[PDB]
Write a protein that binds this DNA or RNA. Sequence first.
DNA 1: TAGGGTTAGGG
Length: 183
Amino acid sequence: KEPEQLRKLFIGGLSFETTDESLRSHFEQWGTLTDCVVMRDPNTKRSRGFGFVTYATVEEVDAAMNARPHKVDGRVVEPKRAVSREDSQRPGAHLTVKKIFVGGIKEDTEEHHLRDYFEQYGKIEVIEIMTDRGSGKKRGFAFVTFDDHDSVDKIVIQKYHTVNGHNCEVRKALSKQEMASAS
DNA sequence: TAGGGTTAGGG
């Protein structure tokens, strides 16, 4: 059995009217639900506008994500891979982005090294292996842009990534200003 | 639109 964290989707933008039951009614169309909850304010019981659904397998999660866009109780909602409580504290953890930062890549890394690891996650649009503009020296990191934000979301929730023979660190790309704001 | 009484003892 796969870990609960990887079987779970965050569902944002729920209608006020959505309950555990109507959410379940919709998302069971793509597999067995082991968990399904709408988050509510404890005192007022009013919906917080989001919840979670958990499938019995990650394959069912993939099937649900392939069926976007999802309309639940008359509202288009925003399903996202569930980011752990720990990781949710990091700058940019919940951004909707198509680009990843790939850190700690060998100096002799070439585009094909990145394709041979990342193409299995989604359609690649742009690969940029970064060099210093003045010196031409390799800087040890790259950016990869995909055609679907879910490709990025599914990558960054995994721990290890092997490029050009060795582990690298993969994070959602923060803009120049976001990087400054995160410092 | 980021979590449900779900996060650092006591030796």
